[PDB]
Amino acid sequence: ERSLQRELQQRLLATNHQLRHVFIEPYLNEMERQFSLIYDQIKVEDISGPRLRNTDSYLREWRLYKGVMADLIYIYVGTAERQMLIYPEWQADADFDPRVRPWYQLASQHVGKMVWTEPYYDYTNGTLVIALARAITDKEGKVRGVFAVDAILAPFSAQLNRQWNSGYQMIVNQSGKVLAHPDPSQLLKPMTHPTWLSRFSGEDGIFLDQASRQFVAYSRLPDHNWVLISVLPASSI
Amino acid sequence: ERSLQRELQQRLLATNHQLRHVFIEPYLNEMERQFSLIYDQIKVEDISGPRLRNTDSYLREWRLYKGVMADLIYIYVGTAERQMLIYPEWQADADFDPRVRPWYQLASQHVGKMVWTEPYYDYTNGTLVIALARAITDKEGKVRGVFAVDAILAPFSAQLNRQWNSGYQMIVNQSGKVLAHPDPSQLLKPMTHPTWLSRFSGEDGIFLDQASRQFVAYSRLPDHNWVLISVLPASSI
Ligand code: PRO
Ligand code: PRO
């Protein structure tokens, strides 16, 4: 009868918790651990000076890291000396100032930790991206530079949604922008049902969107201000 | 001249360290963290008794986990009451005793920690596999059961070797059996050049196999008794 929608919501919610707990959180945690391992290989002295030293070394490293972190688009460091080192090849103007860019700014105002930006447009070719960034420092809080990676979580998104026919799984940020989704063309754009943000009450839950006839389970991520959404259209086997 | 082989070995060694440090160790660490998250969801009471309770729940969980841990073949628990719960579907004899199997035995003699077996043959269909296992306990060291996963690291192996044309990357265990390799048919079998085990001096190094004209870099893994081998045939661009 209608108890079908009972077991169905509790299952959709259980799958959302399990996916969050054993896939999403371990995936992000490793990516951020790998980020910190790359970051710790960076010596301030190589980048607090007018010219960059030992760059051939970091670009050799970064090419290798990108080769196994499939969500990454660029790995780079901008410096307070307006230097910019980047793999792969990226060109910018001479009016380009790294220090004014959102990854540089967010990282500077949270020294000692990494931080994820809102989606923003690449300075040169305009592409939507998201950055994870951390400030490089030297002494009494002198920010000599900022290390960051541009990412588009399409590989992550595909693995999240691999086993999911019928439903789909998405992740949204604090403002409803799509961090992960089965369709690459929706990434980093606003979510399709913005009213859902006001239904994400508490750390998790389930509800039914009578407007789009979709069951919606949601779980909040602990260390990031994001929400995992499991969606099951009332079109169901 | 011959200084080509100089920069070449130091580069092959540098790539081996970087791959070990930023890919292999974070990959294994997440897999073992995900293992422990699955393991901690297991309540002794469900499995220290003649019959298993709430099995529909664990098989619902395990199907989901397998769906995102691509190296896994089976997820299971055997009990000291000779019960066996397993996803996906696995049949055995009535002469099957989990307690005598290598994952059960290794896990029982290292309670409180996880452990990787040597490669061994599936009881029923004979297939070569490797297991990660941990004992489930209750009080003064009563081993009520053992939780374990069968794995074949082909997905891991493909990601390790994705970016590598020219050379290849492999991982061997304490006894030279192949844990990871570009060719799936070599997995879990003895390495092709067993003499290399005696050249893996110390925590890392490089040497040249004059017999197979291959440069060989090696790095030992910290928390596992294994070796990462980067091989570059003297056939080179
Ligand atoms: O647009 C930016 O600010 C960053 C810099 C490197 C690539 N994208
Ligand atoms: O052969 C064994 O012992 C294990 C048990 C489950 C599947 N393979």
Side-chain angles (χ1 to χ4, degrees), chain A residues 2-3 5 7-10 12-32 34-50 52 54-55 57-59 61-62 64-88 90-138 141 143 145-237, chain B residues 2-3 5 7-10 12-32 34-50 52 54-55 57-59 61-62 64-88 90-138 141 143 145-237:
Chain A
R2 131 170 104 261
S3 200
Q5 290 181 11
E7 196 203 8
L8 191 126
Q9 296 180 128
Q10 66 196 47
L12 183 65
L13 193 41
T15 56
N16 182 283
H17 289 183
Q18 293 154 357
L19 223 12
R20 199 210 73 236
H21 179 65
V22 180
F23 179 60
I24 289 174
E25 284 167 6
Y27 189 99
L28 293 178
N29 181 78
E30 173 194 343
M31 190 189 183
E32 298 177 347
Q34 290 174 307
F35 181 87
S36 308
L37 295 166
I38 298 177
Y39 166 94
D40 289 331
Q41 290 176 349
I42 297 168
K43 351 226 213 171
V44 204
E45 65 258 34
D46 289 322
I47 68 94
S48 196
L52 300 192
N54 306 305
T55 72
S57 270
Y58 299 108
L59 307 177
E61 287 162 28
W62 297 353
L64 200 145
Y65 305 157
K66 198 213 163 85
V68 292
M69 301 177 66
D71 301 294
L72 300 185
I73 296 165
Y74 298 105
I75 294 156
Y76 49 97
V77 171
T79 73
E81 280 250 20
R82 282 171 61 105
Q83 295 312 279
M84 182 57 69
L85 178 57
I86 184 144
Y87 184 94
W90 188 74
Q91 291 157 87
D93 289 345
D95 289 323
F96 178 50
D97 195 340
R99 295 169 309 191
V100 63
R101 304 292 293 158
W103 48 275
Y104 203 103
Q105 290 200 5
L106 199 59
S108 285
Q109 63 207 22
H110 289 97
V111 173
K113 84 169 43 219
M114 64 181 65
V115 68
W116 286 90
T117 73
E118 284 264 10
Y120 78 90
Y121 298 114
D122 181 89
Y123 176 85
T124 287
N125 47 63
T127 293
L128 261 175
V129 299
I130 197 174
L132 184 53
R134 182 159 161 176
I136 308 165
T137 53
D138 64 6
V143 162
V146 168
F147 168 76
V149 297
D150 281 350
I152 293 173
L153 308 184
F156 173 57
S157 285
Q159 182 167 13
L160 187 65
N161 282 280
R162 190 197 59 95
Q163 63 186 117
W164 297 112
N165 312 108
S166 316
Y168 63 96
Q169 306 288 352
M170 59 188 276
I171 295 179
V172 295
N173 82 344
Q174 69 187 4
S175 88
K177 306 312 183 295
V178 178
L179 302 181
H181 196 280
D183 179 351
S185 61
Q186 298 307 299
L187 292 176
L188 304 193
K189 291 169 189 68
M191 74 198 286
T192 273
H193 288 110
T195 80
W196 293 352
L197 294 164
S198 62
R199 310 185 68 165
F200 298 157
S201 309
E203 308 314 290
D204 57 271
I206 174 139
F207 63 90
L208 166 72
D209 195 54
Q210 268 103 4
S212 62
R213 273 236 105 161
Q214 284 168 332
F215 305 95
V216 178
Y218 63 86
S219 298
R220 293 184 172 279
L221 271 86
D223 301 299
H224 320 70
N225 39 342
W226 308 344
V227 179
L228 168 73
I229 314 173
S230 310
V231 177
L232 178 50
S235 322
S236 62
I237 266 262
Chain B
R2 131 170 104 261
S3 200
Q5 290 181 11
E7 196 203 8
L8 191 126
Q9 296 180 128
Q10 66 196 47
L12 183 65
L13 193 41
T15 56
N16 182 283
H17 289 183
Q18 293 154 357
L19 223 12
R20 199 210 73 236
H21 179 65
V22 180
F23 179 60
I24 289 174
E25 284 167 6
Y27 189 99
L28 293 178
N29 181 78
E30 173 194 343
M31 190 189 183
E32 298 177 347
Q34 290 174 307
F35 181 87
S36 308
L37 295 166
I38 298 177
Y39 166 94
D40 289 331
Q41 290 176 349
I42 297 168
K43 351 226 213 171
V44 204
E45 65 258 34
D46 289 322
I47 68 94
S48 196
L52 300 192
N54 306 305
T55 72
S57 270
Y58 299 108
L59 307 177
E61 287 162 28
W62 297 353
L64 200 145
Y65 305 157
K66 198 213 163 85
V68 292
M69 301 177 66
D71 301 294
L72 300 185
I73 296 165
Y74 298 105
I75 294 156
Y76 49 97
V77 171
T79 73
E81 280 250 20
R82 282 171 61 105
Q83 295 312 279
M84 182 57 69
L85 178 57
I86 184 144
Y87 184 94
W90 188 74
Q91 291 157 87
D93 289 345
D95 289 323
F96 178 50
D97 195 340
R99 295 169 309 191
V100 63
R101 304 292 293 158
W103 48 275
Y104 203 103
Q105 290 200 5
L106 199 59
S108 285
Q109 63 207 22
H110 289 97
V111 173
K113 84 169 43 219
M114 64 181 65
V115 68
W116 286 90
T117 73
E118 284 264 10
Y120 78 90
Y121 298 114
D122 181 89
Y123 176 85
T124 287
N125 47 63
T127 293
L128 261 175
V129 299
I130 197 174
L132 184 53
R134 182 159 161 176
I136 308 165
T137 53
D138 64 6
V143 162
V146 168
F147 168 76
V149 297
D150 281 350
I152 293 173
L153 308 184
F156 173 57
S157 285
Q159 182 167 13
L160 187 65
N161 282 280
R162 190 197 59 95
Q163 63 186 117
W164 297 112
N165 312 108
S166 316
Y168 63 96
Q169 306 288 352
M170 59 188 276
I171 295 179
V172 295
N173 82 344
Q174 69 187 4
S175 88
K177 306 312 183 295
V178 178
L179 302 181
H181 196 280
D183 179 351
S185 61
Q186 298 307 299
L187 292 176
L188 304 193
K189 291 169 189 68
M191 74 198 286
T192 273
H193 288 110
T195 80
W196 293 352
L197 294 164
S198 62
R199 310 185 68 165
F200 298 157
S201 309
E203 308 314 290
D204 57 271
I206 174 139
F207 63 90
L208 166 72
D209 195 54
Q210 268 103 4
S212 62
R213 273 236 105 161
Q214 284 168 332
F215 305 95
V216 178
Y218 63 86
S219 298
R220 293 184 172 279
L221 271 86
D223 301 299
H224 320 70
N225 39 342
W226 308 344
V227 179
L228 168 73
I229 314 173
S230 310
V231 177
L232 178 50
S235 322
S236 62
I237 266 262

